Design a protein around this nucleic acid. Structure first.
Lengths: 101, 8, 31, 105, 202, 203
RNA sequence: AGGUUGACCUCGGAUCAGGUAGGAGGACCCGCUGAACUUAAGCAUAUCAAUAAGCGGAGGAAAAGAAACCAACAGGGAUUGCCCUAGUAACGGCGAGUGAAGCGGCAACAGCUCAAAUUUGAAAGCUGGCUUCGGCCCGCGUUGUAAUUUGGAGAGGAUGCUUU
RNA sequence: AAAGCUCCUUCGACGAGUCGAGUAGUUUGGGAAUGCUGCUCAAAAUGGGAGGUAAAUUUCUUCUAAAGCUAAAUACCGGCCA
């Protein structure tokens, strides 16, 4: 960590103390992908298939209308980050299918 | 193989 | 309709182990 | 009754100062219970899997053929969860499995 | 275990297999009674994570409730006071249809205590729930320390007082600045803020 | 300012029971002390520093000692709440000063601690022997282990030869420069990136 | 015998064996539902008021409660309540008016349980019936009852001492 | 038989018609930043929530929801005793 300046204002302000590093808390491990969890998710994905909105998005990505696909994913899911992540995941799915075929 | 945990 | 004394005093086995090996101790602090 | 007799024999061996492994042999049984069989399939221990055709809700076993196909386990769908329960001394078994058998079998 | 697979499959509610199962189950539940006992949970993973155990004294009851808003029981659907600029068709009930379902199941089985409930299916007219109930008078319940808290008289009709999960959600019992008015009880907080405290040496 | 437009008379709270409530609290404290004797009536609390820029000048008692503090003082986290040490698993140690203070606090507590055996006939190695079990004891850890120096000492004397030289340009000029740099940290970085891009384009 | 004999699943019957619910009380408590008089010159925003009335559910307290918190500090550390924050931030026709929270001091303090794991070298768990009080039965349960684990971690190892 | 301490290559499961988005009613000091409910859409895996001015980009800080229990300090025009 960057040492504090000892001043009341400016960059890196604050009372000068020597920061220590801590072992990472196990409550912060959430979000990390587990091997069994990703295995189960892949199996359930190939068993269940796709939702109709995902199929429509896949057709849009296949036609290459990426801006229209992102707008459709935004109006479906609700927010821009979720739309972008879903579109990236469907890029991964389409690339996997194309490299399989 | 897929394992839930390390066993004895 | 109140629970019996034995059913009210039943504890889990993990709790039994914890109370067996770390109970409330009798202590004093010197001045 | 068999378990009670085995426990009495093992208690006799313990009293005489011998381990239970000296008087009891390694068992070989069918494996049952859905969580246990799914764990054995994931650990690739089960040699053969038999799934009942009439489990309600069907979601408990709808993934099991795909899991067996991915793990490379021989599986077969058979008629009768009651028929499997007659094997496992229960009213109903959703799935059974064999991991290993004796040398003569 | 299989329940991990059931959880990940229950997340995908628009897949063909899940939609087919929901359709046939909605048909069955609509031709059954409005409130009827289920012999077993149709969503075992959800029941298990909400607290159901395959032990004597645990009961599952399935219930359907009419979805949508509410209407004031006024004559001819009209009010005779000041104009409110809105109709009675657009009034919203402050509790959930899930909570209404738990109350009706508790009134049907007044000898049990409602533990939790979960969504199983819906259509245009009804929403379908399955409610877990626990028998406080069963010896297997009373001897188990993980559940015998529900045998105490303070847990009589939790669904009627908002002490279930949907009741906590509707009462807004969460920490933080977004729940300043409701985290400790809305009416209690109002009484605390509106009381006039006069001390002796003021 | 003051208004009474609601029905204020239904919820007027008078406090004629203030001396009676003081008597009730003192009776409850005597009963608790008699039940907990010879242990202190309260738990050992760490010294923590108050948040925000207004109150960071002062220290106070916290909820409980951290797991790192207990491990550094050599007290297991299951034994610690059984001998009157409060434990807080939410607090972290971001600097060594707070941990050093609280670890020294825990070591003084463990040094002044008397531990009676679970069975009087069978004392253990970790148990205080009977010939040291007789000593003068305290019954208030908040008084015996209070925040002894809550603020910094406001007055200190140094020699005239040891005067600091001072910030070059003046302290007011230093504050103004720090404020200006904080306000202009971004535009200088953007100008540096633009100059680097121009140099890469026309190198 | 196979046009027979059974096993499950689901749904029923019984003045079956054993239990439980209703009503009262409702000052305080948890919810739902919900006004108007009044105050704004009158008056559909507003105010009274998230009140009165109405309905449901508890206890000696109830409720809340061990952070998907506050913060931006040298960081605090479950909940509740008092003082202060503060008539402040903020909201508000044509304005009458409304109005918190962090920090800080104090009273009191207490932490934990599941689901998501294969016991698999042995459902080790439990309701009920009969007891000679040793146990034996009818069952529940493998669509999962015990032990183990709950993020503060834990599972596996390594290691040598302590504990009941 | 169980239990604690110390160190570690590795593993390290964590709750879905739920979160979230739009809309309507209601509510709030949060009529730019509030909560609740109904309808429609409807997730993800270092992911998600929050960081009181809308949107994008890059960082950072904090926790870990959608399961549950728990005394004390607090209230008390009802009941009983004083």
């Amino acid at each position: 960590p960057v040492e504090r300046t000892g001043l009341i204002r400016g960059l890196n302000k604050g009372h000068k103390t020597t920061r220590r590093v801590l072992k990472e808390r196990p409550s912060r491990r959430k979000g990390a992908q587990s091997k069994r969890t990703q295995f189960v998710r892949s199996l359930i994905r190939e068993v269940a298939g796709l939702a109709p909105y995902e199929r429509r998005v896949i057709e849009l990505l296949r036609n290459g209308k990426d801006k229209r696909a992102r707008k459709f994913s935004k109006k479906k899911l609700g927010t821009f980050g979720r739309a972008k992540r879903k579109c990236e995941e469907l890029q991964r799915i389409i690339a996997e299918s194309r490299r399989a075929h | 193989a897929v394992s839930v945990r390390k066993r004895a | 309709r109140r629970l019996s004394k034995e059913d009210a005093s039943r504890v889990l086995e993990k709790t039994k182990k914890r109370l067996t090996h770390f109970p409330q101790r009798k202590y004093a602090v010197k001045a | 009754q068999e378990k009670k007799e085995r426990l009495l024999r093992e208690a006799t061996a313990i009293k005489e100062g011998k381990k239970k492994e000296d008087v009891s042999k390694k068992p070989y049984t069918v494996k049952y219970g859905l969580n246990h069989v799914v764990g054995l399939i994931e650990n690739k221990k089960a040699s053969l899997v038999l799934i009942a055709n009439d489990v309600d809700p069907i979601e408990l076993v709808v993934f099991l053929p795909a899991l067996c196909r991915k793990m490379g386990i021989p599986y077969a769908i058979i008629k009768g969860k009651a028929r499997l329960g007659t094997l496992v001394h229960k009213k109903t078994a959703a799935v059974v499995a064999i991991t290993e058998v004796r040398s003569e079998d | 275990g299989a329940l991990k697979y059931l959880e990940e499959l229950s997340k995908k509610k628009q897949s063909d297999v899940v939609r087919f199962l929901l359709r046939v189950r909605c048909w069955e539940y609509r031709q059954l009674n409005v409130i009827h006992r289920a012999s077993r949970p149709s969503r075992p993973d959800k029941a298990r994570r909400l607290g159901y155990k395959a032990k004597q004294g645990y009961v599952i009851y399935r219930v359907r409730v009419r979805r949508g808003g509410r209407k004031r029981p006024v004559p001819k659907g009209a009010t005779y006071g000041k104009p409110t600029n809105q109709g009675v068709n657009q009034l919203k009930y402050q509790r959930s249809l899930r909570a209404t379902a738990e109350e009706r199941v508790g009134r049907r089985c007044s000898n049990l205590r409602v533990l939790n409930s979960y969504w199983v299916n819906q259509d245009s007219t009804y929403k379908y729930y399955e409610v877990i109930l626990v028998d406080p008078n069963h010896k297997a319940i009373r001897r188990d320390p993980r559940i015998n808290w529900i045998c105490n008289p303070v847990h009589k009709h939790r669904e009627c007082r908002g002490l279930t999960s949907t009741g906590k959600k509707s009462r807004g019992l969460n920490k933080g600045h977004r729940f300043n008015k409701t985290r400790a009880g809305r009416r209690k907080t109002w009484k605390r803020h509106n009381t006039l405290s006069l001390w002796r040496y003021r | 300012n003051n208004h009474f437009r609601k029905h204020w008379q239904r919820r007027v709270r008078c406090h004629f029971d203030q001396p009676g409530k003081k008597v009730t609290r003192r009776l409850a404290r005597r009963a608790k002390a008699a039940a907990l004797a010879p242990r202190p009536v309260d738990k050992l609390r760490p010294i923590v520093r108050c948040p925000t820029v207004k109150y960071n000048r002062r220290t106070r008692l916290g909820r409980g000692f951290t797991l790192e503090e207990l491990k550094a003082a050599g007290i297991p986290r299951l034994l610690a709440p059984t001998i009157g040490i409060a434990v807080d698993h939410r607090r972290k140690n971001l600097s060594e000063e707070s941990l050093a203070a609280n670890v020294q606090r825990l070591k003084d507590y463990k040094a002044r601690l008397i531990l009676f055996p679970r069975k009087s006939n069978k004392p253990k190695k970790a148990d205080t022997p009977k010939d040291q079990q007789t000593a003068e004891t305290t019954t208030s850890l908040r008084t015996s282990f209070g925040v002894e120096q809550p603020l910094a000492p406001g007055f200190t004397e140094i020699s005239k030869s040891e005067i600091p030289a001072g910030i070059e340009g003046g302290a007011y000029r230093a504050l103004r420069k720090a404020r200006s740099d904080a306000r202009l940290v971004g535009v200088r970085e953007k100008r540096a990136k633009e100059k680097a891009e121009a140099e890469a384009n026309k190198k």
